[PDB]
Design a protein around this ligand. Structure first.
Ligand SMILES: CC(C)(COP(=O)(O)OP(=O)(O)OC[C@H]1O[C@@H](n2cnc3c(N)ncnc32)[C@H](O)[C@@H]1OP(=O)(O)O)[C@@H](O)C(=O)NCCC(=O)NCCSC(=O)C/C=C/CC(=O)O
Ligand SMILES: CC(C)(COP(=O)(O)OP(=O)(O)OC[C@H]1O[C@@H](n2cnc3c(N)ncnc32)[C@H](O)[C@@H]1OP(=O)(O)O)[C@@H](O)C(=O)NCCC(=O)NCCSC(=O)C/C=C/CC(=O)O
Ligand SMILES: CC(C)(COP(=O)(O)OP(=O)(O)OC[C@H]1O[C@@H](n2cnc3c(N)ncnc32)[C@H](O)[C@@H]1OP(=O)(O)O)[C@@H](O)C(=O)NCCC(=O)NCCSC(=O)C/C=C/CC(=O)O
Lengths: 257, 257, 257
């Protein structure tokens, strides 16, 4: 398909599938533009309360297509302003994102997978940082996410030595939250995304903003931002519903506003 | 008791007990003012070298009293400047704090428990972030503490899905340092707090300041603050005692100055 | 030996050995000047692509020599500008550093060991923060490294209570990456350092810069620095070699430029 991102809506969930299975969903500028466009649509679509990202075929993504750039003096500083708006869009997404890692995620493919709020892997899936084997540094936010997700000791080993991690090893480190058999991965991930699509979408979005900023703030700054964002969550119809549901001891019926 | 914070001194330890057992020690502005007052007294009392915080009855704390605010347009930005001076006081406390989590700690109750320097839980105690089920974001410093304590991967799952964690699960993640039978919790926690109340109180206070600031500093800034605070610890009578005790291979007798 | 740092080159590796075995490699200003000088030489020597740091005798290092300062009013703020250029040099080293922890690492000895990019310990080796037992705060970058390496929950316990950790406990926490029998430690560590000395030295150096800065940056700042440093790695002969080797499915032959 032109752009190489498949798009499907179900029950409040936009399902995005990386679709270059013949090249293990290797990333090109074209694929990144299509993914940006799809994330923008998902976020704008008032019928969408959650996103699910997965790969077509054997792989999640092998990362940058190492054929896309033809022997010329590479300008990665320039190009990464492109990987960069996609990462900006993922990081700031105002709806929850499930990632279903169906196979290998390497390099920027591993970066993209780790931007999921909740991450599931198939048995048989694998992670490898990859960049150092091409003489490159981690990019697409991997140098930001990895030490936060697995701690600095594991981030050093994973990045410097680029070992291949099994899905069970990934589970141990916090790279994923759940490992499921390959034939059940999309059912389980879609089940979780539909759960989140009934959730308090505004609370999810603002909680994600606090988590993104937490490490660079002083405690004083963190308490100030908590105050500001709790002010905004406090004004939502969902907060009022949440309080009613607790007082009546029934499930909340959230609307995402 | 008026203010709902019980206060007792033993052997250098101020014991603070959240005391609204009939509402699972649910937090009100009144309780927060009483806790602030008690922390201020503990810190000012030269007979106190350590604090121990626990709950009365079944619960540690169920967090914000979801009856305190009566159907009016809530102003959480305003109110949190109140949760906020209490968190400021906890974070900056110039004496070590043990927390004994005797039962459920939910929402701001979980926030308060996690401000302990050393944290023990009873078998049967439990943690739940709770905020997202009311359509709110984590507050009272939970968005600051949780990713630092358990890493970002576990913080995402705990905050977005609000699962109930057993004391043994909490131990695994680093939410607590020790799990003990319910009938031994106060004996063990008081034993540890009395140990710290013989400790180098100034070294504890300055070590806590370094830990609070560590993530937002450059290595250059971190080394500069280490230099400044080690300068201050170096001038204490306790440092001179610590050096004598090491040279003579005997226990130090610290005074907290 | 004058300066108490032994220096030996093998197969692209500068081997540095802390050499005051009679005082468990206890740190003095003189030892720190010698270590700074040795790190500077290793980094300047175009025949060196990796460093390995270890201890002579029983210990890795017992940390500051608690005989060096003679009963005078200590000025640790002044002196730490000395521990500080050594830590600055370690942190910014533009070649990978393996640490082989052959025995106890306490206080600043533990600080120094944890500056390794990859860390191995002998069975029988041990770690202890130590500072709090002398009434001091963690220094030599320990307040920076420890919470990043083991998370805040373990850093609090390790620093406030100064327990002695076995090599297997250290492995569990991420203080080291590998534990090996004492008689195999230098063979394994030298084997790993020779591996890294064939590696893409520029990618290692720039990856280390991203990891050092990651926690204090916004995601926007982190993506900007990734762009800048990937630009520089992209211009290296090693990047061009890495791409050729992947396209031909053969091992890269990196030069470190
Ligand atoms: C671990 C995998 C991904 C999978 O192994 P396996 O499943 O055994 O497959 P394979 O290695 O046998 O490859 C099968 C085919 O896919 C191709 N393939 C795999 N990865 C990529 C790839 N990344 N680019 C182009 N082709 C790729 C292979 O070349 C093969 O093609 P062929 O059938 O021989 O024609 C392995 O292929 C691998 O290490 N690939 C390279 C991964 C890699 O280095 N990714 C790029 C890191 S750099 C990055 O992502 C961002 C860089 C930004 C700066 C910039 O460059 O703009
Ligand atoms: C996990 C517990 C805490 C305990 O379960 P369990 O032990 O089975 O007890 P229960 O749920 O059966 O409750 C027993 C009673 O306590 C009451 N209770 C429990 N939590 C609270 C509570 N937080 N507020 C008022 N009442 C509470 C229940 O309503 C019941 O009252 P009743 O006997 O029916 O009259 C459960 O009650 C629970 O999820 N409670 C709500 C926890 C909660 O959402 N906390 C607030 C999060 S929001 C926060 O803390 C800060 C917000 C700041 C912004 C602002 O609002 O200012
Ligand atoms: C865990 C060890 C390191 C090892 O135990 P073990 O292997 O059983 O040996 P030991 O304790 O029996 O000591 C054997 C000998 O080494 C000496 N030794 C051990 N550590 C040091 C030491 N750090 N300084 C001088 N001597 C030391 C002992 O005093 C003994 O000397 P002797 O044979 O009795 O003459 C234990 O010795 C120990 O706790 N030592 C003190 C560690 C310590 O507190 N280090 C300093 C932390 S403060 C720091 O590093 C930076 C401070 C900067 C501010 C400033 O001061 O400038």
């Amino acid at each position: 398909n032109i752009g190489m991102i498949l798009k499907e809506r179900q029950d409040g969930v936009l399902v995005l599938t990386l679709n270059r299975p013949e090249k293990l969903n290797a990333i090109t500028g074209e694929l990144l533009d299509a993914l940006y466009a799809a994330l923008k649509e998902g976020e704008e679509d008032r019928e969408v309360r959650a996103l699910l990202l997965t790969g077509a075929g054997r792989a999640f993504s092998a990362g940058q297509d190492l054929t896309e750039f033809g022997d010329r003096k590479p300008d990665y500083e320039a190009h990464l302003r492109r990987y960069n708006r996609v990462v900006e869009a993922l990081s700031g997404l105002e709806k929850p994102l499930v990632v279903a890692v169906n196979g290998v995620a390497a390099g920027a493919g591993m970066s993209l997978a780790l931007w999921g709020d909740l991450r599931l892997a198939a048995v048989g899936a694998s992670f490898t940082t990859a960049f150092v084997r091409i003489g490159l540094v981690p990019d697409s936010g991997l140098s930001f996410l990895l030490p936060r997700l697995v701690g600095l000791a594991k981030a050093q080993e994973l990045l410097l030595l680029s070992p291949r991690l099994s899905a069970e090893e990934a589970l141990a480190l916090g790279l994923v939250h759940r490992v499921v058999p390959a034939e059940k991965l999309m059912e389980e991930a879609l089940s979780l995304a539909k759960e989140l699509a009934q959730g308090p979408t505004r609370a999810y979005a603002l909680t994600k903003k606090l988590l993104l900023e937490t490490y660079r703030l002083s405690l004083t700054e963190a308490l100030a931002l908590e105050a500001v964002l709790q002010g905004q969550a406090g004004q939502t119809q969902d907060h009022e519903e949440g309080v009613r549901a607790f007082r009546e001891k029934r499930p909340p019926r959230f609307q995402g506003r």
